[PDB]
Every structure is written in C-alpha cells, then in structure tokens.
Amino acid sequence: DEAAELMQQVKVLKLTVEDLEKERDFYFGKLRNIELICQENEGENDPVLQRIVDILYATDEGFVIPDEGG
Amino acid sequence: DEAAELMQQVKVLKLTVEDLEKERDFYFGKLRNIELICQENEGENDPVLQRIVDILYATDEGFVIPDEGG
C-alpha cells in the first residue's frame, strides 16, 4: 500500500515532466527561429536582431548554485 | 522497501520537474522580451518584429490530443 501511493505520485510527477519537456523543446527551438531572422539581417540591414540575440543568451538568475548534478 | 525505491524515483522525477520549471519560466518570459521589441517597432519602423511575433504564437505539433487534463 505504501508504494501504491507513490505509484500515483510518480504518475503526476512524470506527467508534469512530459508536459514540461514538450514546452522546453517547443520554445527552445523557437528561439532558434528568432535567431534565424538574426542570422539573416545581422550585419546587413537590421540592428534590431542583435538586441534579440542578446535575449537568447541572457540568463536570468545567474546565481552560482552549489552542488549541481543529477 | 517497495516504496523506498519509488522514494528515489520521485526524487529524480521532481528534480527533472524543477529543472524544467526554471527552463519553462526562464524562456517563457524571454519571448515576452522579444515581443517587447515588437510592441516598440511594430507599425512604426520595423516589419521584422511582426514575423518574430508570429514565432511566439506559432504552435509546433498542433495535434489535437484526446483526453487532456491533470
């Protein structure tokens, strides 16, 4: 019975994982599309793309977390 | 002992969740920054922003999944 409760818990946990995985990948490849426009107009016509490139490499909460791993 | 194995499993599962949560939110608010540039130049100077706006509302794998919920 003890594990049976966790059987349900790993369910909601992994489903949140799967829900997040599709979001992570979907949006991740999306920045690549915005970079696509950058690699087209950068240094050629539009400087606006450069400041959007900064976005893609700007990391929010750049705190050095101790003990990273899996 | 049975649940003890799942105790480790919910650990890696939730940690993947937390790893994904920070990615989901980080990048999510990031599109908002690219939209920020859009809401500035759109209809005023640069049409390039409009095609990046399309990005933010373009959904990959627009398959209608049956039985959605939590």
Curated annotation (Swiss-Prot), chains A, B:
Locate the region APC-binding: 30-52
Q: Give any GO molecular function from the UniProt entry.
A: microtubule plus-end binding
- Start and end residues of each stretch annotated as Interaction with SKA1: 42-65
| Tissue specificity | Expressed within the midpiece of sperm tail (at protein level).
Q: What is its main location?
A: cytoplasm
What is known about its processing and modification?
Acetylation at Lys-30 by KAT2B/PCAF promotes dynamic kinetochore-microtubule interactions in early mitosis.
| Record's keyword annotation contains Cell inner membrane | no
Question: Where are the residues of the annotated region Interaction with APC?
Answer: 16-21
One biological process GO term for this chain?
A: attachment of mitotic spindle microtubules to kinetochore
The protein's UniProt keywords, in alphabetical order, are: Acetylation, Cell cycle, Cell division, Cytoplasm, Cytoskeleton, Microtubule, Mitosis, Phosphoprotein
Q: Where in the cell is it found?
A: Cytoplasm, Cytoskeleton; Cytoplasm, Cytoskeleton, Microtubule organizing center, Centrosome; Cytoplasm, Cytoskeleton, Spindle; Cytoplasm, Cytoskeleton, Spindle pole
| Modified-residue entries (N6-acetyllysine), positions | 30
The family this protein is said to belong to: Belongs to the MAPRE family.
- What does the entry's free-text domain comment contain? Composed of two functionally independent domains. The N-terminal domain forms a hydrophobic cleft involved in microtubule binding and the C-terminal is involved in the formation of mutually exclusive complexes with APC and DCTN1.
Question: What biological function has been recorded for the protein in this entry?
Answer: Plus-end tracking protein (+TIP) that binds to the plus-end of microtubules and regulates the dynamics of the microtubule cytoskeleton. Recruits other +TIP proteins to microtubules by binding to a conserved Ser-X-Leu-Pro (SXLP) motif in their polypeptide chains. Promotes cytoplasmic microtubule nucleation and elongation. Involved in mitotic spindle positioning by stabilizing microtubules and promoting dynamic connection between astral microtubules and the cortex during mitotic chromosome segregation.
The record's subunit annotation is:
Homodimer. Heterodimer with MAPRE3. Interacts (via C-terminal residues 206-211) with APC (via C-terminal residues 2674-2845); the interaction inhibits association with and bundling of F-actin. Interacts with DCTN1, DIAPH1 and DIAPH2. Interacts with DCTN2, TERF1 and dynein intermediate chain. Interacts with CLASP2, DST, KIF2C and STIM1; probably required for their targeting to the growing microtubule plus ends. Interacts with MTUS2; interaction is direct and probably targets MTUS2 to microtubules.
Per its record, how is this protein called by name? Microtubule-associated protein RP/EB family member 1
Which species does the entry assign this protein to? Mus musculus (Mouse)
Taxonomic lineage is: Eukaryota, Metazoa, Chordata, Craniata, Vertebrata
Quote the range of the complete protein represented.
191 to 260 of 268
